[model samples]
Target: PESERQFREHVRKTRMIYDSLRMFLMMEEAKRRARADGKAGKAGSMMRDCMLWMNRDKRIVGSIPGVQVGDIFFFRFELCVMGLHGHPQSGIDFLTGSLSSNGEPIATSVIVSGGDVIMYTGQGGQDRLGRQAEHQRLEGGNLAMERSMYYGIEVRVIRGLKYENEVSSRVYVYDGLFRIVDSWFDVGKSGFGVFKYRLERIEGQAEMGSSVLKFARTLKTNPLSVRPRGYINFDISNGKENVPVYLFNDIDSDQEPLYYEYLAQTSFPPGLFGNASGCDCVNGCGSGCLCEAKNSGEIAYDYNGTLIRQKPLIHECGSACQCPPSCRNRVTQKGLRNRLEVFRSLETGWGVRSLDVLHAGAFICEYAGVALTREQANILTMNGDTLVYPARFSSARWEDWGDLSQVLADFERPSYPDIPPVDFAMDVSKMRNVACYISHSTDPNVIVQFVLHDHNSLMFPRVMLFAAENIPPMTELSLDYG
Candidate 1:
């Protein structure tokens, strides 16, 4: 229980500092050009200036306690703040200050992508143009790796890869552990002698990070090539959605989930609709507008489409509103922003993951299914059938997003109305989108919020999910299915 509490605290703190840093830089870049002097290369500076970087002295050789094996990070400084690997530039990290018995440094961690039988090229002796200048000395990190190999010490390995953006140059994936088994000298392409260390992944760890992502990417384009046996429908939505939701079962012979109509958005019976009201604002919903008044006199999302804070209910702009689709208020209505997949999870029967990064407070997807009355939902429950009931999610844990003292002083916590208990449930056992496949978790990365934008039914608000923290690619998106 103590470790569990600490894990929660670590996760919260990591998310807080990361979100703050990202938000600050994003706002700064939006105001001016994102050159070096403006907002580029300012992560460490902003962290130090804002006192967000913590425990810089803390170092570890083994895996971090809270961070998992397949965890991915967008920025290198994120790896720094998480205490996974502290070195920002150097490929290797090791302990110092005579902590070892022999008074020699031992390698703690290293960041590289190509692995499994890794011939990790040692650090240094390279010019600014990435050319080998001279011989790499058997000192510092190179010596550390050599000592680790000799002493049979395990080191954490983080896999880094280049992404398709100017801002996020590299994304880091934390592969678990590896032991350096051999060392030698090799002549690289530059005709300079370079120190090389051979390391292999430890036995009985999770699957390799690079392979999993690579497989996922390949499976996305051509599902039959990567996973031929369990290849199922490509787009389960039947071409109704903007993005295809792939369905695959790699584990067992079950090639399909129970059959149902592919519904992209929630549907209600014809006779139960109520009178709809629309906001008259021509531009996007702003201060003192009717839509803002509905959401306690503030917009729900920020400039980058991240939700500012969770509330009891979020009133988004409907179709009848004067604002266009580009309006900030209409976020969830856009539908299927990220590429999602419904794969057979080893632990859980079925689960979901995004191929793209999900920023904090990013809108994921709505619980798309047919809305049913309380009596019908109760009967279905009595018959041992599953239903997505809104009343089960009573505790709104919105405060864990950030700390009030760490962010801007003018950031006011929104006053939320009493979370109204609804009398309807969504029957998603058959007809559903990717949200239905998301497995439940006690500590969830995705959170559910009651949203009312499509229709004006008080008893049947659309169940939508938003990212509770910065979720990296290939990580399972979970919600507290209470």
Candidate 2:
């Protein structure tokens, strides 16, 4: 019912048929003026000039074609100088009197042949009345009459045209007074609806004159059936006619690759075990001990009970059998001394004291959360729905699958067999039929390099480790693919 009412009201208001008599008269005067000025060649020059001016200004400029002088011009003007400044009273006084001796107040004709004239002076007269009527039509109510009663004037204008230029003006005068009338049928609906009105002025001159007029008329209405339920159907009344319709649905089912769910572990600290240059115990200790095993041929001990072994102790097994050197002695020691020195070197070397230390090149593992069929994923995610799957491994290998697989496999194996498997799952569809081999890198400390094996042969799949530098021990690992 609401739709029907709206439709009826829209048709009634928009289907107005305008009477352009006033407009035609103005145009006739314009054309007459143009001919008299010997500028008949530029019949529509005035309108064109107005249009050019309107275009030059940033505001009010639109793509619509420009207006012509002889052609009718229509626009609204704000009347700010009306009742507030006593300007409306002065205008009324000016319009009530005649121009000359022969021009009576009620005379049908007045002439001022060679020069310009200010024919209509009042801001609220016939022109205003016409505008009021048009406004009422647009508002779908009788607001114009109400304004005439309260404000002493009703302004309305219509769509009209002028010939060239010869000013043709007319004004309608009305007695302003408020009165009440009995309702034809009363269902307790009689009451006032508050409203406001504003005046828009349209003015033009002879050379490229513009004429504006307003009219009031009733619009026609039409009826139609209710909209369809569930599904909508449309058909054209004629083969040449076209109309557009849009339909929407609330529920849609689609799926995407759930990559956000999986996590993986990739990198480890640089010096997790320790460096070779710092420990001295295995090479016959120094510093805290006074025993110079190199010169005195025996062990040395310091006052604090700390053991300070001799610097260099030779064994009977040639240079290879010599005691390993301490960190300081290693610089001068040779052969076997250097060999055994490493063990002792490892003890106090610069190794990460705790597993919590983060190292460069360490990466955290990531995984897919919700893997969906291509179609489903596309529909749900509203993207990449129509992508086609590659036919060969080369095409699939375009992206960095090495890192992806490494991450996946790292988390796949049970890091702690004593405990249950980590909380993770993989979609089998992502794994192709072919067995791809992973590869190793030369600088492999931060990353674990693996080769994918097909039977006894290697597929040479490139793989790299992604270590999580700050990951706490015992955390579950997950991996993902793009």
Candidate 3:
């Protein structure tokens, strides 16, 4: 029977995250290896630099509908040989230019210079030489030809690797999935001939470099995620590898403490809105306007509600400013401009990501929690995830109206009897939120700070999270843990 000859024309642009994080972190190392070999390194860097220059205007990668050039695909196989069967193969190493099965050389395969991967077609059954052997050889050629139909399409080659740290033989490595440039058949030293194909990793100069993949814009809903259990509807994926997220509202059998799902709040108190500062502007406020002068002469947001620039301290329109809610100056009050998602992982429970690339200076979300005292902060089975904010707001630039921040700060840094006991705390478990999912990162992409947008609503510090740096598409947002 003729079986599985045609590799699927399409492969998902996603990853099944069943393993550690070490696999996806070797891109810079790949370039280093190529440079040491004196092969595609220089060319790859040149192309990448050009791509970067072109991408400055719009930096995010978009998913489009239908087939497009240069989309990488994968074709997986059990791949074990020598009747070493039952379990799938973990790389039958290559000796000289030949691939080995047990200790013996396999039917035939070769690796050429410049990081190319080649394979011979299987001859299926029979050791006797007859019409069956010869005819079987022709079928190999037919299969190779079928693969050649997708010449320019890039493919990823992933196979089990012999790794020590791995708990199982499941460790895999993905290198350049070579493009099928050519294929043919020839006789081998065993007297049995087979079809062979030549594949290479080409930064294949695609005619459409970085053009908007039109179909993605029309997609009705979000793409499916690998991890199924979630408190609510969650659709998310990472950039380099679309690893699935396992989500659970609380610590349960499915969502272990290792990968606790986030509940990005069903409802939250939207608190005081509109300018309390009392300076009303009917027309749009400009750079030199009086309303801009009131909290420090800078408008924080664009008319479209997207954050326009960066600031160490954000001074939003207060109740004192009489400007309309639609004014460009009011940003902290206006909500999220970019789409966001909460995804869970093993190392860190849950983290946030923009559904698309976000600008360097942008507001991620606000951290709001239920007010609690020091006695309450010391306790919970905690049904959901949570984050903390001091109940009393204080600023370093100005003297404290309340000393709770200084007390909370002192209580955390190795305390003594001299330091007064911390009086206030906040717990946000059941009301898990976008801000709650932020985990600590030394090289953080986001910064969480104490903000005072509404001077009146200052019971608890209005914790604001902002993009600390230019964040890439699908990158998990994080903080240093304020």
User: Taking the tens digit of each residue's C-alpha lDDT, what string does model 2 give over 298-322?
Assistant: 2222211111221111111112222
The model with the greatest lDDT is 1
Model 1 scores a TM of: 0.83
TM-score of each: 0.83, 0.12, 0.41
Clash count, candidate 1: 0
Residue 34 lDDT (model 1)? 33
Error of 3 at 145 (Å): 25
Model 3 Cα shift for residue 230 (angstroms): 7.2
Once fitted onto the true fold, the runs of candidate 3 whose alpha carbons sit more than 4 angstroms away are: 1-222, 225-232, 235-276, 302-313, 318-320, 372-424, 454-459
lDDT of 3 by residue, 1-482 (tens): 11221111111101111000111122234323222212222322332343311222211112122222322111112111111111122211111111122222221111121113456243433444422254244333244233332324333333332222111222222332345566665666666665555555555433221121111121113343322345343332122112232233433344332332333322223442343554556654555666556435545544434343333344566566666776666765554445565555667776666544443345666664555544445553153435354322222211111112221334221121132322445566544445666666654666544445655444333566666433433467766543
How far residue 37's Cα lies from its native spot in candidate 1, in Å, is 12
Query: Candidate 3 at 159: error in angstroms?
Result: 27
User: What C-alpha lDDT, on a 0 to 100 scale, does residue 9 get in candidate 3?
Assistant: 16
> If both were scored by lDDT, which would come out higher, candidate 1 or candidate 2?
1
Taking all chains together, the TM-score of candidate 2 against the true structure is 0.12
